[PDB]
């Protein structure tokens, strides 16, 4: 038995990102997996890291330090319920899939805020705390990204550089850091410019990949993988 | 004369980030520059890219596409006023300094949302009209970042890899994309664990750099610079 959380960041259900999220739900459900979706825009998920994230009273209210405050609130069971609700989904999951369009070589801010606020010290990491000592080892993570640019723009000598270059802060600096084994990314290059036939091709690569996702090994989430040889 | 915009992303005025912002204000003010600060947390700046960012009739109300609809809204002058407010600041500035703690090898979500919402098509870039042809050509940008990890940790052989590696989405994918020339980053390493001696020194180093900022030349904002050969 396998549990999957899909963290989904697109405003429009009729989008290509929506299609990809829905075929994931459909295929993983068909397999018998337990599936949960965090539809961040529908949730009006809060992105900002603020003192509202700790309930009651602070470890030092004279000088607010978000990292220390949330670390202490996680230990005293004092985080805001939107955070802890996401933490439970994560804790239960065997696989976390992030489904998003590439905004400025990264995640949309609403999803950045989910990372910033959900992946707190004590839960995902400790200081010291991290990479293999992070707290989500044993779990799989996978970034399913759509891009505005064509594949060849994301080549080494392409204007955008290699797609791997922009994955670093997300796969390594965030997911690896917290202990996830990182599955190879799903990159759906320039679906908006693509034909209905290229778009169906991309959706089926993904449904077909999902059929065998539990047979994948994580990538080696190394600087050599992103930047070499 | 010179105009400077500081986009500042920390919750606590008494923080080290706060110190760095304040010393920038004080030195650039002393020089006679015109200075504006967008204190995003104090502004409760909206980070989410939503349909609330456009006030008129949508171009395609059946299938919402944020990029398309904000592009059209920019041209029609129908974007939300918070966006327009920040666009004016950027338009006027000669130099934009981003002052923030590193969250997940990137900017805090509040600041990611500023990038996502303020730097829209028509304003910051066109297609064509990006990278060296971006619409903010002639302006300078600088990242002033604080880190949890020590300097040794952000080297090629340190735990986090080289600091330049995480700068790529920001410097290249966002600022260079919009036409900015990019000044060398100011990275203040591990202030929380430094002595007050050391913290004072890092503050004073930044103030001293600012004394001669207008004599600096930008980096070559290329793959080679960020990653090597
Ligand atoms: Zn890694
Ligand atoms: Zn560049």
Swiss-Prot record, chains A, B:
GO MF annotations, alphabetized: chloride ion binding; dihydronicotinamide riboside quinone reductase activity; electron transfer activity; FAD binding; melatonin binding; NAD(P)H dehydrogenase (quinone) activity; oxidoreductase activity; oxidoreductase activity, acting on other nitrogenous compounds as donors
Chain positions found as Phosphoserine: 78, 195
Cell location: Cytoplasm
Reactions performed catalytically: 1-(beta-D-ribofuranosyl)-1,4-dihydronicotinamide + a quinone + H(+) = beta-nicotinamide D-riboside + a quinol
Cofactor(s) required, per the database record: Zn(2+); FAD
Transmembrane feature ranges: none
Function comment: The enzyme apparently serves as a quinone reductase in connection with conjugation reactions of hydroquinones involved in detoxification pathways as well as in biosynthetic processes such as the vitamin K-dependent gamma-carboxylation of glutamate residues in prothrombin synthesis.
Name of the molecule in the record: Ribosyldihydronicotinamide dehydrogenase [quinone]
Organism: Homo sapiens
Lineage, opening ranks: Eukaryota, Metazoa, Chordata, Craniata, Vertebrata
